[PDB]
Amino acid sequence: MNTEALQSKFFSPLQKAMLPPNSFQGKVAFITGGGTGLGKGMTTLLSSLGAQCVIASRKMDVLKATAEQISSQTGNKVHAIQCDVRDPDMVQNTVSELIKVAGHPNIVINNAAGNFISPTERLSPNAWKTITDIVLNGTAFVTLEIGKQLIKAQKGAAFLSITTIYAETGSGFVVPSASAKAGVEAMSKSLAAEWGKYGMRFNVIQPGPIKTKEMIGRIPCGRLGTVEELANLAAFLCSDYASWINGAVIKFDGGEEVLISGEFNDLRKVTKEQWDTIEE
Amino acid sequence: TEALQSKFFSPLQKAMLPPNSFQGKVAFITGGGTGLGKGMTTLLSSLGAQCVIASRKMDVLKATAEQISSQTGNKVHAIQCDVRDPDMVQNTVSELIKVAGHPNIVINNAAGNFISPTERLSPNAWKTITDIVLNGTAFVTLEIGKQLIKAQKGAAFLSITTIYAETGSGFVVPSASAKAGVEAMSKSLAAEWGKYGMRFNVIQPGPIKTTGTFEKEMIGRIPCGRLGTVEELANLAAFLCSDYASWINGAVIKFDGGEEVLISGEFNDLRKVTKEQWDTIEEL
Amino acid sequence: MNTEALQSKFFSPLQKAMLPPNSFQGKVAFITGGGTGLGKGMTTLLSSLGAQCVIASRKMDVLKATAEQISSQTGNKVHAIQCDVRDPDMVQNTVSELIKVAGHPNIVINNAAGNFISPTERLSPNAWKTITDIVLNGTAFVTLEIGKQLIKAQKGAAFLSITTIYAETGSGFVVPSASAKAGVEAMSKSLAAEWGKYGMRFNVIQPGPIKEKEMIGRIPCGRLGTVEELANLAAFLCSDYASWINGAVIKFDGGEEVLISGEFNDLRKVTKEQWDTIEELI
Amino acid sequence: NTEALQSKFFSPLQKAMLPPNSFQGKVAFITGGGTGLGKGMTTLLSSLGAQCVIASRKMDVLKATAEQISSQTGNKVHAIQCDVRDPDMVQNTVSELIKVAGHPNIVINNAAGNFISPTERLSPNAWKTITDIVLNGTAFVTLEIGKQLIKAQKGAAFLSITTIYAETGSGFVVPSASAKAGVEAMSKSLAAEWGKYGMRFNVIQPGPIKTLDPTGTFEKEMIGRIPCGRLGTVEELANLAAFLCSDYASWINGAVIKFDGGEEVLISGEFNDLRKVTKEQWDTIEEL
Numbered sequence A: 001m002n003t004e005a006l007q008s009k010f011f012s013p014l015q016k017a018m019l020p021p022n023s024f025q026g027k028v029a030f031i032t033g034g035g036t037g038l039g040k041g042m043t044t045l046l047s048s049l050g051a052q053c054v055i056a057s058r059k060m061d062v063l064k065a066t067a068e069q070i071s072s073q074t075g076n077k078v079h080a081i082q083c084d085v086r087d088p089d090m091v092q093n094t095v096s097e098l099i100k101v102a103g104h105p106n107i108v109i110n111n112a113a114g115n116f117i118s119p120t121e122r123l124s125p126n127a128w129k130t131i132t133d134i135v136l137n138g139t140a141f142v143t144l145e146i147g148k149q150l151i152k153a154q155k156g157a158a159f160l161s162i163t164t165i166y167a168e169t170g171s172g173f174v175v176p177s178a179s180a181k182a183g184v185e186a187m188s189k190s191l192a193a194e195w196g197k198y199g200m201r202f203n204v205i206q207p208g209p210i211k212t213k214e215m216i217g218r219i220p221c222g223r224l225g226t227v228e229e230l231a232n233l234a235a236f237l238c239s240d241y242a243s244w245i246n247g248a249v250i251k252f253d254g255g256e257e258v259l260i261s262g263e264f265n266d267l268r269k270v271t272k273e274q275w276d277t278i279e280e
Numbered sequence B: 001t002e003a004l005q006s007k008f009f010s011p012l013q014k015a016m017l018p019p020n021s022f023q024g025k026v027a028f029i030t031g032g033g034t035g036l037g038k039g040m041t042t043l044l045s046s047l048g049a050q051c052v053i054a055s056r057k058m059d060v061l062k063a064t065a066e067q068i069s070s071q072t073g074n075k076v077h078a079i080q081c082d083v084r085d086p087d088m089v090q091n092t093v094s095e096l097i098k099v100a101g102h103p104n105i106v107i108n109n110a111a112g113n114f115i116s117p118t119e120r121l122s123p124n125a126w127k128t129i130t131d132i133v134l135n136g137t138a139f140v141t142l143e144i145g146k147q148l149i150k151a152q153k154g155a156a157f158l159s160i161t162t163i164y165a166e167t168g169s170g171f172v173v174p175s176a177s178a179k180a181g182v183e184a185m186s187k188s189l190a191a192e193w194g195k196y197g198m199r200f201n202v203i204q205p206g207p208i209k210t211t212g213t214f215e216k217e218m219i220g221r222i223p224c225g226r227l228g229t230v231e232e233l234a235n236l237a238a239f240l241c242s243d244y245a246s247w248i249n250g251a252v253i254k255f256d257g258g259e260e261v262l263i264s265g266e267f268n269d270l271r272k273v274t275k276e277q278w279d280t281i282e283e284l
Numbered sequence C: 001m002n003t004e005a006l007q008s009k010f011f012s013p014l015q016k017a018m019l020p021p022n023s024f025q026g027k028v029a030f031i032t033g034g035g036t037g038l039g040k041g042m043t044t045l046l047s048s049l050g051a052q053c054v055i056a057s058r059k060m061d062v063l064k065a066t067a068e069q070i071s072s073q074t075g076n077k078v079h080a081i082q083c084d085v086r087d088p089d090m091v092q093n094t095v096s097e098l099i100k101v102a103g104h105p106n107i108v109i110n111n112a113a114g115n116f117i118s119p120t121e122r123l124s125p126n127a128w129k130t131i132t133d134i135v136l137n138g139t140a141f142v143t144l145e146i147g148k149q150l151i152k153a154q155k156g157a158a159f160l161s162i163t164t165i166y167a168e169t170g171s172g173f174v175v176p177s178a179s180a181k182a183g184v185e186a187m188s189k190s191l192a193a194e195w196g197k198y199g200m201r202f203n204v205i206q207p208g209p210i211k212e213k214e215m216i217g218r219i220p221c222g223r224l225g226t227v228e229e230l231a232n233l234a235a236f237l238c239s240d241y242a243s244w245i246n247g248a249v250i251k252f253d254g255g256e257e258v259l260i261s262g263e264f265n266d267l268r269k270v271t272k273e274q275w276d277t278i279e280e281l282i
Numbered sequence D: 001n002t003e004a005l006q007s008k009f010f011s012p013l014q015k016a017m018l019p020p021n022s023f024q025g026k027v028a029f030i031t032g033g034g035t036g037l038g039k040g041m042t043t044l045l046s047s048l049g050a051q052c053v054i055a056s057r058k059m060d061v062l063k064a065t066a067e068q069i070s071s072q073t074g075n076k077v078h079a080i081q082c083d084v085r086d087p088d089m090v091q092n093t094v095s096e097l098i099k100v101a102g103h104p105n106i107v108i109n110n111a112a113g114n115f116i117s118p119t120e121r122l123s124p125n126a127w128k129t130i131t132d133i134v135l136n137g138t139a140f141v142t143l144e145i146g147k148q149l150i151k152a153q154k155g156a157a158f159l160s161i162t163t164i165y166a167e168t169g170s171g172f173v174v175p176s177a178s179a180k181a182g183v184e185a186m187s188k189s190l191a192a193e194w195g196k197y198g199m200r201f202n203v204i205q206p207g208p209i210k211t212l213d214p215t216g217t218f219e220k221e222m223i224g225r226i227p228c229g230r231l232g233t234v235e236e237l238a239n240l241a242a243f244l245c246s247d248y249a250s251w252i253n254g255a256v257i258k259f260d261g262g263e264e265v266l267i268s269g270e271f272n273d274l275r276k277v278t279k280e281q282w283d284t285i286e287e288l
Ligand SMILES: NC(=O)c1ccc[n+]([C@@H]2O[C@H](COP(=O)([O-])OP(=O)(O)OC[C@H]3O[C@@H](n4cnc5c(N)ncnc54)[C@H](OP(=O)(O)O)[C@@H]3O)[C@@H](O)[C@H]2O)c1
Pocket: A032, A033, A034, A035, A036, A037, A038, A039, A056, A057, A058, A059, A060, A062, A083, A084, A085, A086, A111, A112, A113, A114, A134, A138, A162, A163, A164, A165, A207, A208, A209, A210, A211, A212
């Protein structure tokens, strides 16, 4: 069969829960940006596997609707907490409330982000600072405060940051996002080293484009990723099956980064007949 | 301090994937008779995969194949193969297709290593490691790949390298070079062979439990406070070779308890500094 | 001869200017943090090679002194401008003065930084934010503003960011710095790609420890680096000899990163006779 | 325009950068020294006073190049015939190098082979050929010189020329990508292991250098993938190589330097394809 058909047959999405039913029972999970997109998918999966989930972002309206929607789907409680992660006080309140309504988290997912697609010369200083504040400082603030509380309580936890494939390579047009996300990965590798002694491990997923265009022509797997596939990976990394995975950075991108970064991968449209000619 | 690590990084050694979830799947595992390869074969077999294992020593291979087979009730086939010989590799792939079918899962795990000052290695010793690790994975991949293209079938490929493949390391230089070559190949074929339904990933393991003071010292370099287990490694490998990971391609996953981030961080040696010392140094 | 002597003989520092005399004549360089340490070293060399340098940091006192000190040493004028790089208004005023007194820069060195060595638990959100602000946002604010000006003027420039070896790997105890520095490296690689069309190139040096005994044992070259050595590498990367070097990250660390990062490098104190024993056992 | 800015601001400086005679008294051993990049590097080092020894398979081209450079610089270049994949030839070659010139201060591993081909069309032997020349050849040369240098209590600066795809991998050049990646891991390993012997090891990863494309349109399309807007030159590469092999770089060890006009960062960046978007198009995307 042709490319598209091989890709569809051999890279078909498996969009159901992977981990055993109720495997996350008795675990508390905290997800920033848990009300939409990737955060929402991860919450849905964790809740449905029995985790007690707490989600936090700026828009209380969307947050409550999502918490209520997942709650009635899974039977398990999702708590919503309004929080701007770039404000240390709201963060401190948020963690205080987190611990009151659920208890110390076993799973912390740093997923809240902001992004502008723009030529960099059209960005104001404030536009840049906004992305940096939400992504990097926001993740630092949440990690610092939860980290401090866990040390005091002598409990550990699994941390996961969702970054991006361009965090490692950089990219034009998404520059403050690229910088801030790169900062997030270094933080994770840093705290994986520093905080092992406290029972805290830190890992990263770098996603490519998830269905939530013909960037597909740049994806060896021949489709966009799905939220449910990403969530399975996240759940695995935040589970006890992955208790020895620490400091890891995992690409979830259908092969996109290796494709675009490989110098001669622009020969991929060259036909059989054209190859016969080149070899002569 | 070691109680927090023991409680919070406790190994979970049972099968993580759903029972019988690899039914109808065929897995080919080089170096399948021992260590990490055995543990991976065991897990895949217990989840219903039909496994084929291949390496040089037939007696160990047969014993392992028989021992797993009676534990799981699913058949494991042994094939004698020196992966550095293209003819033997050809016969092996052919036999694999004959007795089990085209593989859905390919695991390149066969390896050799010397721990030695590089200046003590002969050219032959160097070339041996390169042949087994790099050319062998290549030969296996090339041949399975050609058959899969012919048959219009795809597969998930997995190579076990090491944390020093990315960084290099003194004393394991030929291994470091060959394993790095293995990683570049996976990334290369993830891009080239996606169009054929083949995806390619890599696990970089740290020290796995395979006077006892060296072991104790090794742990001091590990944030998770213990060595890894074979069963944990196999859960990760089975995950990567499962349809749950059908959009995972070109990935490199450290399985090391945090060891690489610890040793590679410039100021991580400051972990030995005590709280009372920190109080003094913060005043300065 | 022993290890120490081999290292001494074969890795000896050459602390003199490498590039041809007056090869930076007609070039203007802007160096943040150029009043102390590595910044001062780099200014001294670029000035001594004929560049018109402009240095910028918070403390006018030290900045004015350094500028006069280098100027009298080299004969070429070094302008000081007071600037907190985390304050975008000051950055805007600073770049405007740079262009007024010297001209559009040909060389831009982002070197201003701050750091705390501390357990991460002991950091306040403010302490964290301060490092992030100086290092990442400061470098961004300076680059944004100068870049905008160079695009408007249709001129290009070579940019250089001084980071560190732990920016790529992370490190405990220096976590806000590691994060901000990694951010700076991603920025450089991003703008190397985006701004090539405008004649701007972006490179990075990752230094190890520059002029304790504990490190020297982790440095294959067996000594700390010198400021003059680092300055030669920086000068090369900001020169027309490196006009095709863009998006590069160069470790300047005596081999330290490869040493500490390599799993079996802890075996480096094993003696010949122990190696005899180890081999026999296998 | 864009071509005017790039031409003006990324203009090649193709003359020697290091001080005249700065390599007098030094000996340099270069594999593949007779052609292309190796030749260019040999020429510069000779011109700065180094005694060069070049080695590869074809004695005819090698001897010609050696003579041609010697006459241009007045400094002797020795040719030695050697297949780097043959450990016995390598041993004889190093022994000759030491007898005719001395223990090398500079070692440049530049000999290579490559196929551009769908991986499916490669025989085992074709794959093995690339691995043997690039990885094993570099190892054999390094192993033998290293052993001699240790025995003599001398050190040296080692340099390997790889490629931008050694770190990323790449379809269509898979044996070469793998072997070159092995070469990089080797440099990093020996930077750590052999520092104690006074040996340092660095790498340059070149992008496309001005020495399949009969019309000239593939080259033109390659340039569109390069921020600097041109291909690199041999003389520029040679300048970077000489810097890394000079005493000015005596504290540079385990480093990997891209020399690529920004190509690798351009192609690796997910959203860099947005460089095609015009000012007017951006005016609408930002207005939403
Ligand atoms: N979707 C993809 O194809 C893709 C690809 C690559 C990477 N990613 C990464 O994956 C993550 C998820 O992104 P997404 O696509 O699901 O949604 P998104 O468009 O990135 O939305 C960001 C989320 O973060 C929250 N947020 C924004 N500012 C906040 C703040 N100051 N404080 C607290 N929360 C804040 C938002 O909720 P509120 O508005 O209520 O504050 C929202 O839920 C991001 O980190 C992104 O970088 C996604």
